[PDB]
């Protein structure tokens with residue numbers, strides 16, 4: 001809500017690289033661009049957008065953006081085939097494009113080369129690998145087991161999916177969590193915990209410290225984690241995730257993307273900056289110099305960056321992986337899957353028993369509105385309006 | 397199932413700004429679907445309520461909530 005354009009991007013993303021692109025826009029156009037990194041901008045943008053005041057451009061995962069679309073402007077691209085078709089699919093909601101894809105942020109297997117010259121290509125190796133490394137005085141493999149984003153790549157490897165896709169749509173009723181592939185995947189992860197190869201309590205924070213310290217041989221993470229391994233003076237490399245039962249681990253992949261706020265009047269100015277400054281081999285490089293994006297949506301600079309085994313490995317994990325659906329019911333997937341996994345590790349429920357639960361919990365509507373007394377049928381509450389109600393609340 | 401709150405008890409209506417995330421996800425998507433004067437059963441899942449944390453001391457983790465809501469007036 002002004003005559004210059006304001007950009008919001010996360011603190012781990014290297015805003016100073018973006019700033020130098022904005023300064024080049026200023027030398028060429030005169031328009032001043034300021035890039036901010038608010039503490040909880042992902043949650044903050046919806047609250048402020050509803051008032052009709054928020055930044056002109058916002059940079060997040062494509063997945064959050066699907067919810068913004070059910071508060072965000074259609075971009076118009078024509079000869080913008082500089083980006084891959086699969087990256088464009090990330091930013092498409094009801095056949096409309098919500099944003100400009102930037103980076104492909106797929107999980108990978110990262111490994112200390114001095115602790116392990118050649119990483120294991122299979123999951124089944126890691127137990128045997130851990131005994132050899134445990135004797136030396138270190139671990140094999142530490143990553144976040146709390147959040148299902150990191151456990152899922154193993155789980156969906158031998159089959160099993162959030163929501164089946166048919167006739168160009170997602171089917172919120174058809175969930176692939178209580179099938180054999182899911183069970184085999186999960187049971188292998190539980191067994192690794194049962195055999196003291198991994199600890200249920202370990203989280204992202206704990207795992208990050210150990211790999212950066214050099215206490216663990218391998219971790220699992222995105223290119224968001226690369227700058228911290230760099231600073232930690234640890235000889236590391238990024239490879240393909242280990243296969244499970246000869247099938248590749250299929251991580252859900254997030255795409256860093258640039259959307260425009262409907263309440264931004266600077267849409268024409270913002271579009272020029274994204275289309276003709278950000279999505280440029282030099283533009284993207286300025287960012288990557290500050291903090292790496294891994295694989296990028298632009299083909300120009302991706303063909304350059306993929307000479308690095310890290311970026312080449314990232315894209316590989318993204319291809320064998322599937323792109324993260326942006327549909328709302330994914331909230332209820334992640335919730336269903338996080339509780340299933342955590343309780344399998346806890347030994348609260350059996351694997352077969354937790355995934356049974358998950359298959360139900362994932363497909364359940366967030367809210368069902370059944371009528372008691374009908375309304376006028378005309379007037380509906382609109383964002384920024386105060387609702388006056390009576391209510392009775394109780395547990396089901 | 398046990399009752400944790402009622403406005404009709406206190407006999408003062410409850411006012412919230414839609415889309416400001418003052419209330420749970422189930423209320424924002426849910427009351428947005430009600431016409432003015434309408435009364436409806438909101439069956440909210442934990443994801444759209446307080447999820448795995450719950451509300452400390454009042455609502456357990458993984459608790460599906462049921463709300464009897466009557467949309468009285470817009471302001």
Ligand SMILES: CO[C@H]1C[C@@H]2CC[C@@H](C)[C@@](O)(O2)C(=O)C(=O)N2CCCC[C@H]2C(=O)O[C@H]([C@H](C)C[C@@H]2CC[C@@H](O)[C@H](OC)C2)CC(=O)[C@H](C)/C=C(\C)[C@@H](O)[C@@H](OC)C(=O)[C@H](C)C[C@H](C)/C=C/C=C/C=C/1C
Nearest residue numbers: 391393400401402410412417418419420421423451454455
């Ligand atoms: C005496 O009764 C309490 C409410 C009780 C608490 C316990 C629950 C079982 C319950 O009984 O409500 C309940 O029935 C319930 O689950 N509700 C209330 C009806 C709406 C749906 C749900 C709810 O969202 O409550 C809400 C739930 C418990 C917490 C919120 C969930 C959504 C999340 O986005 C919020 O982030 C912060 C936190 C509570 C509210 O509805 C109140 C109005 C809102 C807040 C406190 C926050 O938004 C706060 O954040 C700074 C604000 O911005 C407000 C406006 C600032 C002003 C000064 C505060 C007013 C406080 C009023 C408090 C009241 C009437």
